[PDB]
Amino acid sequence: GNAKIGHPAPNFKATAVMPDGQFKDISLSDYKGKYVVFFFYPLDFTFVCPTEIIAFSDRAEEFKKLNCQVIGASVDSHFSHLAWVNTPKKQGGLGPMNIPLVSDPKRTIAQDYGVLKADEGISFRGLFIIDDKGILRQITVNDLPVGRSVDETLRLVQAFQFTDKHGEVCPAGWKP
Amino acid sequence: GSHMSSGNAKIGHPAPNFKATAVMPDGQFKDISLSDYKGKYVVFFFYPLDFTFVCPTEIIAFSDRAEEFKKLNCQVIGASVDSHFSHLAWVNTPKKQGGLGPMNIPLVSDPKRTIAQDYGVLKADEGISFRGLFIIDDKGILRQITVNDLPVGRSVDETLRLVQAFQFTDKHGEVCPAG
């Protein structure tokens, strides 16, 4: 991997499926001036709970209020992302999305983000917080097969922005 | 190496073992290994800068509630690039004077930065707050890496729920009611 805290998030250009249903080649740099929640999940339909994408799609406006763009990703092609989008969510599909879904079928974005199982060719679950300047602020990687909490993720973005503005909430030990 | 941009720590693999001198809760030094906790979950905090750069209340809050992790068959361990005597000095300084006071958890020393290297958390460019949390399960397998430079104290409650989620899912599988 190249992803590293305090450095620019590795930039990719990739095909995404956009909220309007269309394919568009996008880059993380497109969102400079906004915080970004970028999350990797293993595989459409078979190795992820639909609701961990749905809960972020549903609540995307809570994120846009914080000036934050949410983007999902997996090693799936854009064709497979679109198929899951066009599967109804009462059929355990995604249904229509308020957020873009990046495709990584060559596995090079997952490798670059340091979340690839090279043998299996699927990512772990990864959460990346990237600030309005494009700088990587958090990495979480795990193999925990439950959905990420939207509330917690909002709170985290809020904590980063707060401390961006105000400095340390929990002061360093040397400080008077 | 790792899938990680640095270190040898890899999700789904044995956590890198280390043998290092620890200051134990009562203040004795003991040379310990991560393998000493096989059979238990471990919550491993690593501070890649010495404790003067760290918010003592973060570590204190975890030490204070260590019994709650012990109930979950989980050992909390804190580690930093401090020497073992530095750690002893910190715990032997009362909180009221800005120290740590007595801890309910071991503090592991990494003055040679070999644990830091192995765990992918050598200090570099980042905010001064850069530090890591690692979740190791009772088989010794690394289950989570979180790293960030957020100068806010980590939540004990969230961490407890995290450990319980790992443990729940270890025994009952994936969680997806609507899947």
Ligand SMILES: C[C@H](CCC(=O)NCCC[N+](C)(C)CCCS(=O)(=O)[O-])[C@H]1CC[C@H]2[C@@H]3[C@H](O)C[C@@H]4C[C@H](O)CC[C@]4(C)[C@H]3C[C@H](O)[C@]12C
């Ligand atoms: C400079 C700071 C003090 C800064 C400070 O003023 N911290 C604010 C806390 C005040 N609060 C009211 C918020 C405390 C909360 C009250 S409560 O009791 O509720 O926790 C003090 C606090 C503890 C200190 C170190 C330790 O001794 C260990 C060691 C002893 C050696 O010989 C000399 C080196 C070393 C590293 C010491 C250096 C330094 O000297 C430290 C960082």
